[PDB]
Structures are given as structure tokens and as C-alpha cells.
């Protein structure tokens, strides 16, 4: 919200339009190591955040920071490769700028991916967790992308998140996972946002499991919130890249350097899976 | 604390004095839909935050933002209709400016009202929860109105909140509720502050119940903290305006638009109840 | 991290070097009432934060704010008497400036002390809790000293804290406590950071015990995080100065004014104990 003015979004959206023949309907934010989805697009038109009017440029990850309008599995997409994270200093109203821009672009759906740790034991590093809900930890303390005066033009002052992650798409996906006979069922769970670079400590790991979080991460939640605030049908997954050490028997890891899950075909499984799901995303056409 | 200087408070308080024949003893902050209490005052003298020297002006709610010095049930009041919330961008040292101003006005008691969600099942939308305690969620993370250098003139560096909500007034109220034979006993509980516009998700609803919160809201706590820091006898209620969905059987709501609880006579029950309680508030006179 | 530039640290470290004949290996941050350790140093050379190039000066506690390079029990130290706390308005990247400076000074170990409340019943006011882990509460919400672009020169973007408090030194201390026959075993536990001046309320006391915190405080965690980010072997204790009231049978206290624990010989027991432990701290020499 804060920082930009509606015309900032207007301006950026419009410029994007007057610069891409494409008019997307689906906005996809690729987590770490899931940027590969950008390869699944046709008629791809790449834009470096850099060259886009108000778009936050990136920090070190910048050397992996672009917005690509393509076409994914029978849907006008606009993938964002390399999202913005709070721990990079981006105030949340910047992290989520793009989600507000997309809405203005005409995007009606936002599929949000992300690599995350595993709090739930049943998760196996590599798994893919359908996000059914979220525990916005930094929001409790004020770190919410909607802080500041509300832009009625975008949405309500007190949006409900109880329904964030689309029930329809979550069912029309637990099923689709079945469809291609993916062996092990698409895990489903609650993702807990946690900001700050550092990785949880076993003590923190436990207050996260107790709170009910199935997976932990440092993003998504802010983009879901404003996507919701906008209307944007929202659904997304979480590629468990490493299991968090819930007890003092350490010497066992969960390194991001050890993102190799996302540095494997795990990321590839979630990518194809997201492409197929383009078919499950409702069209703005309808047609009975 | 921060942002203003002691003379900012001095100045504003004094101006208020040199502008109102009244010298209040009780400061009341009306929650959403409880501003009606302003109607229960006699010799009311209204001041738009706007016209008061350092008082934060409001955002959209501004079109419901004034401080009215009246007289409530045998007590010199100063009601604040439409409080400041963190999610409106007000840094906490602005949200709570008024509480510090009141103290300088001579106010010795602060009754804080607020509309909130219902985490405790025994609560019925419409209920009125006496605040016995609070879980300051944004304070854990730094969002405390006392951050910054401490003004010894106002209080201690490390105030205790263990005793925030006055035991005396809480008992001299559970009783008073009995007095007028109000049918169902005045519920009592722990209010949990949660900032950010958004409404909790079922996942968040559950970490709130587990933490021990009886009701959830986006205010009060900051004003209680500095009121305490000042001395200010503090007691207040929480008008359960909607029950929070603790489980995935949604399609059931808790809309603020659906503030109709506070958009009913519920707000009226708490208002009269607060007026009567003016009698239970100790006087600075004493007189055996 | 943020606020300063690497050359700010470079500059301050170097100035410190070109101003102290000493080259420390161990950096000690004294909690409240544990500054006394400064008396256990030989060839002590005191520096007021004030006179050091980029070092945050202090607020009221300033009248107890210096960095003393001495020699503690056969180790080149650099004690910091009176640490910086978030609740004083210091952004975390200032609270922890010194830890980053020390590393540049050549310091390889950081022993962090702190006075804290007692959530665990088995703790007796006066006890000394070896910090085995921590629950960084303000970090979940964004208040992490590493927010902002990461300085690869100092460390990784996603440091692990699972191993923060050195296992070696924690065992080579539970033992050392035995060594001098200290009667009651060196308590060990999880410290929970909580910012904001205020002291927890019974409601907050309980969400702290439930989260798994053995003791509560308003510091250490930020300095541990960046110490870790740097490499810095980290271990530290927590002098339980008062038991937190976990239930509504109050009129029982935990005043910081009632820091007399730390205002006793309790602080003295932890101080000597820290001096002896200088012997357990590995040398950069090695020598079989
Ligand atoms: N907090 C957290 N995030 C993780 C973890 N594993 C992956 N992520 C996602 O952010 C870092 C990329 O690996 C983990 O163990 N903890
Ligand atoms: N967080 C939260 N606040 C509420 C709820 N209901 C009322 N409030 C008070 O703030 C919004 C006004 O209705 C609710 O369900 N959740
Ligand atoms: N939060 C908290 N910190 C404490 C307590 N006792 C000591 N400390 C450490 O910070 C204040 C110094 O006493 C306590 O009860 N609560």
C-alpha cells in the first residue's frame, strides 16, 4: 500500500501494457529455484524489474530478477522470476507492488510458489505443499502490506484472509495431482511466514510447529494479502526444500545453499504441475 | 513516546485546558460503533482532533474523529470518538499521543472500549468482555508505544503491565453488571492485539486461541501501556462484534462491515454500562 | 547490517586497534548489573562509546556506557559495559554494531550475558541460565539485525542459528560449573527475546512459557545473530533476576528496580564464573 500512489500503479501497469502485446490473466510469482517456469512460456516477452517504471529493482538476487509475460498452458501469464523479500529491506508495500500492478494489468489470478522449510514430519524434503492457509507472523506485529490508508480503489479496509487460498483451485488441484498419477498425494498445509534472513533455531522450530505451521518461509504471505485485497483468485504451493530440525539432534541440515531440492527436479515437478494447472484456472470468458 | 517532546504534550494539554472549561478526570476511548457514548455527555464541548495543537488528525475514519469533553454519570470525562490504529500508519507514539495528553489534562482514569473478534467459544457475538489482561503481540516484536528514550516525567523505563487492567474496577464492575440484573454475566477475558488491516485466517485464529487470547483486536493495548506508564487507573471492555472462524467450516462470517453488533444496541448496552460505571470510578477527592 | 557501510565497521575497528595496544580475541557483552566484570580485567583500557568513531552513544543508561579492553583470565578481552537495547530506539543494526566491530578487531568469541525474567519454575531468582537456544520473537516479525542487503564480507545471506550457542562451550561449562563445586547445577534453557520496555503480563507470561521459553529478556538475541553471521563462537548466560508471574496470584514481583539479584552477588557469581570460563575458550593459537 504505502509509498506508492494509485497513479504509480496506474502508470506502471499502463506502461507495461503499452509495452507488451500480451494482456495477462494469470500472475505467477516463482519461488527460489522455481524461476524455471519462465522456460515454459511461449511468445515470452521479458522485462527486467529495472526497466519497469516503479517496480522495485533487486538486491544481490537482482542477478535473477525479471518479469516475463508469456503464455503458460493455455493462459496469458506474467511470471515474476525472483520475488522481493522483507529480509532484503523492501518495505512490504514494495515487496507486494507487483501484485497490485498485475491486478491493474488485468490479472485475475495469482499463483504464488515458494521454497520453504518443513515443520510437518510427514513432509519429505522435495515434497510440494499446497497452501491451504497461512499464519502471517510479521503481520501480527504490524508488518502487513496493507498498513497505511486503504485504497478503496483496490479494496476494503479490513479484508478477510480466512479464505485467501482458493478452495476451488485447491480441490481442482488435489484432484489434478491425482489426474497425472503423481504417486504420493499433493501434501497440503499451513505456511508460516517468518521474516529475517536467519534460519529458525530448534526452539523457534518448535513454536512454529505448535502454532500449527506445516511449512516455514520468508515470503508469499505479503503478496497473498494484497492479491486478496484486490480480489485476485489466489492459490499457490510450497516446495519443501529442507526439513527444519525440530529437536537437538542436529548435525542434520536444512541449508538454502542446500536448495538442491529446488536445485533438483523437485522444482521441475512443481513447475510442470503449475503449468498443467493453468487448465484448472477459470477464464474471464466463462462460456458455460 | 517518540516523535513528540514533553512540551508537545504540555502544550497540547494546556491548550486543551485553556479551551475547555472542563477539567476531566476520566478519559474514555470509544471503540468502533461505541462512539455513541458521546451522546451521554452533558455540557459537551467537542474538539476535532484537527483543531487541537499536536493531536494526530485522522485518515478515512477522520469523518468520525473528535474529542468531546462532557460529563458522564457524575464524572468529568473527555471521550475520544474514533481512536487511532496502527494499521492506519500511525506510529504507536501517535496512536497513544492522546493518552499522554489526558494525563496532563488531569485525567486519572482511562476506560478503553473496542470492538473485537471472538476466539473464546463461550462468547456470543454481541457479548461484552471485561478486559482482565492482554497479549501485546506487536510489542513482542518491538511495536511498543514506549520504545525510545523514556520520559521519567511520565513514568518508568520498565513499567509493569502484569496489573494493567484495574482489579478494583474489574471487580467493582463484574458486580455492577450484576447490580442492574443484566441476565448473562459480564464475560471476562484476555484481549490479543493484532495489527494490520486484514482479518485473521483460521490458522491465525488458532494460534490466537492457543496463546490464550479470549478476543482479538487491532488497538487498545498501545493506549493501555502508556496509560499505565502514566499511572492512569485502566479498565475497559471489548464488545465481541463477531466470532472468529476457528475451523475450516467457513462460509460463516465475522465482517467488520458486519459491525452491526456495534451497529446494534450491543454497542448501546456497553455504553450505558460504561456510564453507570462512572459511579464506580474512584474520585480524586476521596472523602472517606 | 543496514545503516553502516563496511568501511564504517572497518574504520571503527581499525581506530580501536590504532588506539588500544590490546588485540582482543574474546568480546563480552555484560548484561544489566553484570558490568562489574570490567573490574576483573588487567591492563584495562576504557573507551566511552562516545569517543569511538561510529559506535552508537547511549540514552539514559549512557551514564553506564563504555567498552573496556582488558585481559580476563588468560584471554584478550573487550568487554562492553551496558549493551544497546531495541526498546531504547536503536535500530537493531545499531544495537549490534559492536559485534560486527569486534569481529573486525579479531575477536573470535563473544560471550553474551543478560539479566532476564524466569518463565521456568525450576529457576529461582538468582539462578544462572546457560543459554542453549533462543526464540527470536522480534525476528519473526522482521526485527532481525541482518535485514537489508547481506554483506558477504561478513557472512551468508541465510545464516543458520540452529547452532548459535556453542555446544562445545556449553558442555565445557556445564562441566566447569561442576568443577568449582557450585552446589546447584548451572541451569540451562531457552531465552526468549521480547522488545519493548514494558514487562510481560501474566497472559504474555503464559504464551512465553507455552512457546518453550525458559527465560525472557530484551536483548542478546540480536547480538548473537550477527555474531553467528560472522562466525564468532557464541555462548552466554542469563542471570534470572526475577520470576515472571505466570498466574493471577500477583502482588508478587519481578521489578527491574528489583534488579537486586543483579544488585547482589548473583551478578558476582556469574561474573567470576565467566572469568574462569575464559580458560575454556579455545585459543586462536591451538598448539595441540
Ligand atoms: N525459514 C526457512 N525458510 C526456508 C527453509 N528452507 C527453505 N526456505 C525458504 O527460504 C530460503 C530458501 O531455501 C528453512 O528451513 N527455513
Ligand atoms: N482482528 C479482528 N478484529 C475484529 C474482529 N471483529 C471486530 N474487530 C475489531 O476490529 C474491526 C472492527 O470490527 C475480528 O474478527 N478480528
Ligand atoms: N522481559 C523481562 N525482562 C526482564 C525481567 N527481569 C529482568 N529482565 C531483563 O530486562 C530488565 C532488567 O531486569 C522480566 O521479568 N521480564
Strand fraction band of chain A? 15-25%
Query: Considering the protein shown, what is the CATH homologous superfamily of chain A?
Result: Nucleoside phosphorylase domain
The tally of helices of chain A reads 8
CATH class of chain A: Alpha Beta
Radius of gyration of chain A: 18 Å
Mind summarizing the main beta sheet of chain A?
5 strands, mixed, barrel
Number of domains of chain A: 1
Helix coverage percent of residues of chain A?
Answer: 25-40%
Ligands, ions, cofactors: 9-hyroxyethoxymethylguanine
Return the CATH architecture of chain A. Answer: 3-Layer(aba) Sandwich
The most extensive interface between chains reads: A-B, 34 and 34 residues
**Strand segment tally of chain A:** 10
**Within the largest sheet of chain A, what's the order of strands?**
6-9-8-7-10
Distance between the termini of chain A: 36 Å
Shape of chain A: globular
Oligomer: homotrimer
CATH topology of chain A: Rossmann fold
Structural class of chain A: alpha/beta
Subcellular location (chains A, B, C): Cytoplasm
Protein name (chains A, B, C): Purine nucleoside phosphorylase
Organism (chains A, B, C): Homo sapiens
Pathway (chains A, B, C): Purine metabolism; purine nucleoside salvage
Plain-language structure description:
Chain A is α/β, with parallel strands linked by helices. Chain A has a single domain, classed as Nucleoside phosphorylase domain (Rossmann fold, 3-Layer(aba) Sandwich), CATH 3.40.50.1580. Chain A contains eight helices and ten strands. The first copy, chain A, has a five-stranded mixed β-barrel. In chain A, α1 crosses α3 and α3 runs parallel beside α7. The longest helix of chain A is centred in the middle third of the chain and has 13 residues. The termini of chain A are far apart. Chains in contact: A-B, A-C, B-C. At the A-B interface, β7, α4 and α7 of A face α4 and α6 of B.
Amino acid at each position: 500500500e504505502n509509498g506508492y500512489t494509485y497513479e504509480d500503479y496506474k502508470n506502471t501497469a499502463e506502461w507495461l501494457l503499452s509495452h507488451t502485446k500480451h494482456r495477462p490473466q494469470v500472475a505467477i510469482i516463482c519461488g527460489s529455484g522455481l524461476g524455471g517456469l519462465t522456460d515454459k512460456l511461449t511468445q515470452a516477452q521479458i522485462f527486467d524489474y529495472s526497466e519497469i517504471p516503479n517496480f522495485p529493482r533487486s538486491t544481490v538476487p537482482g542477478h535473477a530478477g525479471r518479469l516475463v509475460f508469456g503464455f503458460l498452458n493455455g493462459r496469458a501469464c506474467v511470471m515474476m522470476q525472483g520475488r522481493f523479500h522483507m529480509y532484503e529491506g523492501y518495505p512490504l508495500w514494495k515487496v507486494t507492488f507487483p501484485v497490485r500492478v498485475f491486478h491493474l494489468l488485468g490479472v485475475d489470478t495469482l499463483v504464488v510458489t515458494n521454497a520453504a522449510g518443513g515443520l510437518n514430519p510427514k513432509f519429505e524434503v522435495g515434497d510440494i505443499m499446497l497452501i491451504r492457509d497461512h499464519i502471517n507472523l510479521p503481520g501480527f506485529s504490524g508488518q502487513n502490506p496493507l498498513r497505511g490508508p486503504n485504497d478503496e480503489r483496490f479494496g476494503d479496509r479490513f479484508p478477510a484472509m480466512s479464505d485467501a487460498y482458493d478452495r476451488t483451485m485447491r480441490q481442482r488441484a488435489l484432484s489434478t495431482w491425482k489426474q497425472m498419477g503423481e504417486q504420493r498425494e499433493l501434501q497440503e498445509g499451513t505456511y508460516v511466514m517468518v521474516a529475517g534472513p536467519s534460519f529458525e533455531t530448534v526452539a523457534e522450530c518448535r513454536v512454529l510447529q505448535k502454532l500449527g505451521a506445516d511449512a516455514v518461509g520468508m515470503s508469499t504471505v505479503p503478496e497473498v494479502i494484497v492479491a486478496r485485497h484486490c480480489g485476485l483468485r489466489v492459490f499457490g504451493f510450497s516446495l519443501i526444500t529442507n526439513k527444519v530440525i525440530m529437536d537437538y539432534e542436529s548435525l542434520e541440515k536444512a541449508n538454502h545453499e542446500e536448495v538442491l531440492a529446488a536445485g533438483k527436479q523437485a522444482a521441475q515437478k512443481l513447475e510442470q504441475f503449475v503449468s498443467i494447472l493453468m487448465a484448472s484456472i477459470p477464464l474471464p470468458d466463462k462460456a458455460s
